[PDB]
Amino acid sequence: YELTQPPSVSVSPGQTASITCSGDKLGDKYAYWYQQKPGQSPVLVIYQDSKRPSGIPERFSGSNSGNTATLTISGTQAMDEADYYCQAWDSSTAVVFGGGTKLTVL
Template sequence: WAQAVLTQPSSVSASLGQRVSITCSGSSSNIGRYGATWYQQVPGSGLRTIIYGSSRRPSGVPDRFSGSKSGNTVTLTISSLQPEDEADYFCAAYDISTNAVFGSGTTLTLLG
């Protein structure tokens, strides 16, 4: 990844079946203007796009993954957490001056 410009929590945790939200904050030159994309990375695997255009879900991604945008912040919400959701989640966005900016990633840990 390039230097992180977007701000994400370093980690979140929740129990199986619960709901969790991960935020990603930027500015009016990136998220505020263009929205963002969310990626999932399971250890040992490549990046998988789970949300694009801030709230659109690619085919094949379960509908328990959802995204929203408010101002310069996007939020990824995962409802009814499953074991396979334990992963790192990254946000990325276009930026008017630097083409692309990234978050440093959020590690989702399942409790219990």
């Protein structure tokens, strides 16, 4: 895995959770965030650094600056509990991947 993510992030209900994703010159690529509940389809929650796909709650936001992309979930709900994966897309090169973060609410 060419991108580094914390192994885990924990928050109490309603608190804001943030997940980081770092790698050399990450700011040069676009960041993409996938929510992955074990045994279910991955869901794209943020794309192109900071954009939100239709149907994704407004509490999901993201940014990408320098060597670090960040996913933020405000008002974290029990249904947000999942593994989160960052990926970065370059105009040319093949996708690079983070190793995932387990988000726990409690």
